[PDB]
Amino acid sequence: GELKAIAQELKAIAKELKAIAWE
Amino acid sequence: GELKAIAQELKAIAKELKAIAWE
Amino acid sequence: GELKAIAQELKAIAKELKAIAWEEKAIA
Amino acid sequence: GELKAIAQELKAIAKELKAIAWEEKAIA
Ligand SMILES: [N+]
Ligand SMILES: [N+]
Ligand SMILES: [N+]
Ligand SMILES: [N+]
């Protein structure tokens, strides 16, 4: 449900932050 | 670096939120 | 600008999680 | 209580990300 969709949002954000770390 | 450690924090949180969804 | 937008998104999620928690509490 | 603590953690991370962004900006 909602909490799973938010969890997926947080994992998407984790990938953005890693991409920012390395750019 | 910092942003990777924060990304790992967000992935840990995503797993907590999924566990909360299903309990 | 990118990190600042992600920061707003996390604050928005925090508010959403408190709304979810409150609704669960209310219902039970 | 668990979702409320996670919400505080996300708000804390948001502040940390703005501090990181600002330091990068300052330095450049
Ligand atoms: N949920
Ligand atoms: N970093
Ligand atoms: N945002
Ligand atoms: N917390």
Tab-separated table of N, CA and C and ligand atoms in Angstrom:
chain	number	residue	atom	x	y	z
A	1	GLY	N	0.831	-1.224	0.000
A	1	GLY	CA	0.000	0.000	0.000
A	1	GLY	C	0.859	1.265	0.000
A	2	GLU	N	0.360	2.281	0.743
A	2	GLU	CA	0.957	3.653	0.773
A	2	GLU	C	2.417	3.614	1.199
A	3	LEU	N	2.641	2.910	2.293
A	3	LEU	CA	3.965	2.838	2.871
A	3	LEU	C	4.924	2.148	1.912
A	4	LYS	N	4.470	1.130	1.171
A	4	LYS	CA	5.361	0.543	0.147
A	4	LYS	C	5.729	1.571	-0.945
A	5	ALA	N	4.763	2.364	-1.415
A	5	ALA	CA	5.013	3.349	-2.482
A	5	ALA	C	5.997	4.376	-1.945
A	6	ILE	N	5.860	4.765	-0.689
A	6	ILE	CA	6.806	5.751	-0.064
A	6	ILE	C	8.193	5.114	0.045
A	7	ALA	N	8.251	3.846	0.440
A	7	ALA	CA	9.527	3.113	0.501
A	7	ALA	C	10.206	3.156	-0.879
A	8	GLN	N	9.446	2.932	-1.953
A	8	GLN	CA	9.981	2.946	-3.337
A	8	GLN	C	10.494	4.353	-3.667
A	9	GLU	N	9.764	5.391	-3.243
A	9	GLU	CA	10.216	6.802	-3.358
A	9	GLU	C	11.563	6.974	-2.664
A	10	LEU	N	11.699	6.503	-1.411
A	10	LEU	CA	12.975	6.645	-0.666
A	10	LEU	C	14.092	5.900	-1.416
A	11	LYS	N	13.847	4.712	-1.952
A	11	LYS	CA	14.925	3.999	-2.705
A	11	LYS	C	15.323	4.760	-3.975
A	12	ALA	N	14.369	5.393	-4.656
A	12	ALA	CA	14.620	6.260	-5.835
A	12	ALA	C	15.493	7.426	-5.384
A	13	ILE	N	15.186	8.011	-4.226
A	13	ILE	CA	15.979	9.150	-3.706
A	13	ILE	C	17.411	8.700	-3.386
A	14	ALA	N	17.586	7.516	-2.783
A	14	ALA	CA	18.917	6.982	-2.430
A	14	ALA	C	19.769	6.920	-3.714
A	15	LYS	N	19.184	6.475	-4.810
A	15	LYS	CA	19.926	6.397	-6.098
A	15	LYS	C	20.259	7.802	-6.582
A	16	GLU	N	19.353	8.771	-6.459
A	16	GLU	CA	19.677	10.150	-6.858
A	16	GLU	C	20.850	10.644	-6.040
A	17	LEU	N	20.862	10.369	-4.739
A	17	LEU	CA	21.908	10.935	-3.847
A	17	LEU	C	23.269	10.301	-4.176
A	18	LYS	N	23.280	9.031	-4.475
A	18	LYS	CA	24.536	8.374	-4.910
A	18	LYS	C	25.013	9.010	-6.218
A	19	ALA	N	24.100	9.267	-7.155
A	19	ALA	CA	24.482	9.844	-8.477
A	19	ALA	C	25.077	11.233	-8.244
A	20	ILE	N	24.480	12.024	-7.353
A	20	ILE	CA	24.997	13.361	-6.936
A	20	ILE	C	26.370	13.206	-6.292
A	21	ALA	N	26.565	12.226	-5.403
A	21	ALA	CA	27.877	12.031	-4.750
A	21	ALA	C	28.970	11.937	-5.820
A	22	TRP	N	28.750	11.191	-6.893
A	22	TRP	CA	29.809	10.798	-7.856
A	22	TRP	C	29.951	11.763	-9.040
A	23	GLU	N	29.059	12.735	-9.225
A	23	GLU	CA	29.048	13.516	-10.496
A	23	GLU	C	30.138	14.597	-10.410
B	1	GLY	N	31.015	8.771	-0.130
B	1	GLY	CA	31.135	9.709	1.007
B	1	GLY	C	29.810	9.864	1.754
B	2	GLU	N	29.563	11.116	2.204
B	2	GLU	CA	28.400	11.464	3.079
B	2	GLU	C	27.080	11.078	2.429
B	3	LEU	N	26.952	11.490	1.181
B	3	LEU	CA	25.724	11.268	0.448
B	3	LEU	C	25.483	9.777	0.261
B	4	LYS	N	26.534	8.978	0.046
B	4	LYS	CA	26.317	7.516	-0.008
B	4	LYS	C	25.791	6.969	1.336
B	5	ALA	N	26.347	7.423	2.463
B	5	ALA	CA	25.934	6.931	3.789
B	5	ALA	C	24.483	7.328	4.001
B	6	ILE	N	24.100	8.519	3.577
B	6	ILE	CA	22.677	8.983	3.714
B	6	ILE	C	21.782	8.124	2.818
B	7	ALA	N	22.237	7.834	1.603
B	7	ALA	CA	21.493	6.948	0.691
B	7	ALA	C	21.244	5.596	1.383
B	8	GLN	N	22.260	5.042	2.047
B	8	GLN	CA	22.148	3.743	2.755
B	8	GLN	C	21.129	3.874	3.894
B	9	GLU	N	21.147	5.004	4.610
B	9	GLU	CA	20.123	5.328	5.638
B	9	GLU	C	18.732	5.292	5.016
B	10	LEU	N	18.528	5.970	3.872
B	10	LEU	CA	17.198	5.993	3.214
B	10	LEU	C	16.796	4.562	2.819
B	11	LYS	N	17.701	3.743	2.299
B	11	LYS	CA	17.318	2.343	1.941
B	11	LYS	C	16.938	1.528	3.182
B	12	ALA	N	17.612	1.744	4.310
B	12	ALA	CA	17.284	1.114	5.613
B	12	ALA	C	15.880	1.560	6.010
B	13	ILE	N	15.573	2.846	5.836
B	13	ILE	CA	14.232	3.370	6.191
B	13	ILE	C	13.158	2.733	5.300
B	14	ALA	N	13.421	2.583	3.994
B	14	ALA	CA	12.464	1.981	3.044
B	14	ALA	C	12.095	0.574	3.555
B	15	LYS	N	13.074	-0.179	4.021
B	15	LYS	CA	12.806	-1.544	4.550
B	15	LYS	C	11.980	-1.447	5.825
B	16	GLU	N	12.253	-0.492	6.713
B	16	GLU	CA	11.425	-0.336	7.920
B	16	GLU	C	9.996	-0.053	7.511
B	17	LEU	N	9.791	0.807	6.518
B	17	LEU	CA	8.417	1.240	6.151
B	17	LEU	C	7.651	0.062	5.527
B	18	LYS	N	8.320	-0.734	4.739
B	18	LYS	CA	7.682	-1.953	4.187
B	18	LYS	C	7.303	-2.891	5.336
B	19	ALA	N	8.185	-3.054	6.322
B	19	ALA	CA	7.919	-3.984	7.458
B	19	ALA	C	6.700	-3.473	8.225
B	20	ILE	N	6.605	-2.161	8.440
B	20	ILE	CA	5.430	-1.496	9.076
B	20	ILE	C	4.184	-1.728	8.229
B	21	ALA	N	4.263	-1.580	6.903
B	21	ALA	CA	3.085	-1.793	6.034
B	21	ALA	C	2.475	-3.167	6.333
B	22	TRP	N	3.283	-4.210	6.465
B	22	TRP	CA	2.817	-5.619	6.479
B	22	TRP	C	2.534	-6.156	7.888
B	23	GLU	N	2.872	-5.441	8.960
B	23	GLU	CA	2.827	-6.055	10.320
B	23	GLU	C	1.373	-6.027	10.817
C	1	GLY	N	20.747	22.939	-5.886
C	1	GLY	CA	19.267	23.003	-6.203
C	1	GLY	C	18.652	21.605	-6.157
C	2	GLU	N	19.324	20.634	-6.762
C	2	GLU	CA	18.901	19.224	-6.686
C	2	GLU	C	18.822	18.741	-5.217
C	3	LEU	N	19.860	18.933	-4.395
C	3	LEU	CA	19.811	18.470	-2.992
C	3	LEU	C	18.722	19.216	-2.222
C	4	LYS	N	18.535	20.479	-2.520
C	4	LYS	CA	17.509	21.304	-1.872
C	4	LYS	C	16.122	20.769	-2.222
C	5	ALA	N	15.888	20.353	-3.464
C	5	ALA	CA	14.573	19.800	-3.873
C	5	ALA	C	14.317	18.443	-3.200
C	6	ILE	N	15.351	17.609	-3.144
C	6	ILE	CA	15.298	16.320	-2.389
C	6	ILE	C	15.007	16.592	-0.916
C	7	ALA	N	15.597	17.620	-0.307
C	7	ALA	CA	15.317	17.947	1.093
C	7	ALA	C	13.834	18.290	1.307
C	8	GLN	N	13.247	19.122	0.431
C	8	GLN	CA	11.793	19.446	0.468
C	8	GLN	C	10.990	18.149	0.353
C	9	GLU	N	11.385	17.251	-0.548
C	9	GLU	CA	10.675	15.957	-0.771
C	9	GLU	C	10.697	15.137	0.529
C	10	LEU	N	11.841	15.076	1.229
C	10	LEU	CA	11.941	14.282	2.474
C	10	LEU	C	11.057	14.912	3.536
C	11	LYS	N	11.035	16.227	3.646
C	11	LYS	CA	10.151	16.921	4.624
C	11	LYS	C	8.695	16.631	4.275
C	12	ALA	N	8.369	16.589	2.984
C	12	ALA	CA	7.000	16.296	2.547
C	12	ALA	C	6.659	14.878	2.952
C	13	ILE	N	7.591	13.948	2.747
C	13	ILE	CA	7.343	12.514	3.121
C	13	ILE	C	7.132	12.419	4.640
C	14	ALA	N	7.932	13.145	5.418
C	14	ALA	CA	7.814	13.144	6.893
C	14	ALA	C	6.395	13.515	7.273
C	15	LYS	N	5.855	14.572	6.643
C	15	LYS	CA	4.455	15.035	6.930
C	15	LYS	C	3.469	13.945	6.545
C	16	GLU	N	3.730	13.273	5.416
C	16	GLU	CA	2.836	12.185	4.909
C	16	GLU	C	2.857	11.024	5.908
C	17	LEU	N	4.022	10.661	6.406
C	17	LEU	CA	4.162	9.545	7.371
C	17	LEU	C	3.415	9.908	8.650
C	18	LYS	N	3.509	11.155	9.138
C	18	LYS	CA	2.752	11.569	10.361
C	18	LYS	C	1.244	11.528	10.117
C	19	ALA	N	0.799	11.939	8.927
C	19	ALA	CA	-0.637	11.834	8.555
C	19	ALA	C	-1.092	10.360	8.572
C	20	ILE	N	-0.294	9.459	7.993
C	20	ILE	CA	-0.566	7.990	7.977
C	20	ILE	C	-0.623	7.449	9.422
C	21	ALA	N	0.382	7.756	10.219
C	21	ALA	CA	0.457	7.319	11.628
C	21	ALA	C	-0.798	7.812	12.351
C	22	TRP	N	-1.156	9.086	12.150
C	22	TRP	CA	-2.276	9.659	12.927
C	22	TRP	C	-3.572	8.918	12.576
C	23	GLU	N	-3.802	8.660	11.282
C	23	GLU	CA	-5.014	7.981	10.757
C	23	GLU	C	-5.106	6.572	11.331
C	24	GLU	N	-4.012	5.810	11.302
C	24	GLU	CA	-3.919	4.479	11.957
C	24	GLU	C	-4.326	4.628	13.429
C	25	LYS	N	-3.689	5.528	14.195
C	25	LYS	CA	-4.022	5.804	15.626
C	25	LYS	C	-5.530	6.050	15.793
C	26	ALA	N	-6.049	7.135	15.201
C	26	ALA	CA	-7.492	7.474	15.123
C	26	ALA	C	-8.316	6.189	14.922
C	27	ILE	N	-8.120	5.484	13.812
C	27	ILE	CA	-8.922	4.270	13.471
C	27	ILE	C	-8.882	3.241	14.620
C	28	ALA	N	-7.741	3.044	15.303
C	28	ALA	CA	-7.580	2.074	16.423
C	28	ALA	C	-7.679	2.796	17.780
D	1	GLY	N	4.205	5.574	16.784
D	1	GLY	CA	5.503	6.065	17.393
D	1	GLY	C	6.674	5.770	16.457
D	2	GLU	N	6.719	4.560	15.914
D	2	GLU	CA	7.727	4.192	14.903
D	2	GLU	C	7.656	5.132	13.674
D	3	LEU	N	6.483	5.349	13.067
D	3	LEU	CA	6.395	6.232	11.885
D	3	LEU	C	6.766	7.665	12.262
D	4	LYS	N	6.399	8.089	13.447
D	4	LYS	CA	6.711	9.435	13.941
D	4	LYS	C	8.223	9.590	14.091
D	5	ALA	N	8.928	8.573	14.579
D	5	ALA	CA	10.403	8.640	14.733
D	5	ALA	C	11.095	8.670	13.363
D	6	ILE	N	10.605	7.852	12.437
D	6	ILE	CA	11.073	7.878	11.017
D	6	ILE	C	10.821	9.256	10.412
D	7	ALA	N	9.683	9.895	10.681
D	7	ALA	CA	9.414	11.237	10.158
D	7	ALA	C	10.450	12.256	10.661
D	8	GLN	N	10.768	12.240	11.965
D	8	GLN	CA	11.833	13.102	12.553
D	8	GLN	C	13.155	12.820	11.837
D	9	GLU	N	13.473	11.549	11.597
D	9	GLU	CA	14.742	11.142	10.925
D	9	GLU	C	14.789	11.755	9.516
D	10	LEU	N	13.677	11.716	8.764
D	10	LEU	CA	13.658	12.261	7.388
D	10	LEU	C	13.840	13.768	7.450
D	11	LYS	N	13.207	14.446	8.389
D	11	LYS	CA	13.379	15.917	8.549
D	11	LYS	C	14.832	16.215	8.902
D	12	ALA	N	15.450	15.371	9.727
D	12	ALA	CA	16.854	15.558	10.108
D	12	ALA	C	17.714	15.398	8.873
D	13	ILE	N	17.420	14.387	8.057
D	13	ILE	CA	18.216	14.151	6.805
D	13	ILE	C	18.060	15.363	5.874
D	14	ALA	N	16.846	15.897	5.759
D	14	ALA	CA	16.578	17.073	4.902
D	14	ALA	C	17.504	18.201	5.310
D	15	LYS	N	17.616	18.448	6.626
D	15	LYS	CA	18.505	19.537	7.155
D	15	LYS	C	19.951	19.228	6.804
D	16	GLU	N	20.332	17.948	6.907
D	16	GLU	CA	21.730	17.504	6.608
D	16	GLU	C	22.014	17.737	5.120
D	17	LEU	N	21.079	17.401	4.255
D	17	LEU	CA	21.249	17.572	2.793
D	17	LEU	C	21.388	19.059	2.487
D	18	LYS	N	20.594	19.940	3.118
D	18	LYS	CA	20.731	21.413	2.888
D	18	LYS	C	22.084	21.925	3.379
D	19	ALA	N	22.561	21.415	4.517
D	19	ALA	CA	23.917	21.767	5.019
D	19	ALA	C	24.996	21.341	4.003
D	20	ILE	N	24.896	20.123	3.467
D	20	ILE	CA	25.826	19.587	2.429
D	20	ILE	C	25.770	20.471	1.165
D	21	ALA	N	24.577	20.736	0.668
D	21	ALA	CA	24.370	21.577	-0.529
D	21	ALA	C	25.014	22.941	-0.275
D	22	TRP	N	24.761	23.524	0.903
D	22	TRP	CA	25.240	24.901	1.152
D	22	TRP	C	26.774	24.921	1.124
D	23	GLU	N	27.413	23.932	1.762
D	23	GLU	CA	28.890	23.808	1.864
D	23	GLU	C	29.493	23.662	0.472
D	24	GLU	N	28.939	22.781	-0.363
D	24	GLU	CA	29.329	22.644	-1.791
D	24	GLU	C	29.234	24.021	-2.459
D	25	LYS	N	28.078	24.701	-2.394
D	25	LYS	CA	27.870	26.068	-2.961
D	25	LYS	C	28.984	27.020	-2.498
D	26	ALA	N	29.055	27.300	-1.189
D	26	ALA	CA	30.131	28.076	-0.524
D	26	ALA	C	31.487	27.744	-1.173
D	27	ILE	N	31.933	26.494	-1.092
D	27	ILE	CA	33.272	26.077	-1.608
D	27	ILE	C	33.439	26.474	-3.090
D	28	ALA	N	32.399	26.363	-3.935
D	28	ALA	CA	32.445	26.707	-5.385
D	28	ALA	C	31.847	28.105	-5.626
E	1	N	N	0.478	1.166	3.614
E	2	N	N	29.275	12.745	-0.396
E	3	N	N	11.057	19.030	-4.086
E	4	N	N	13.789	9.807	15.154
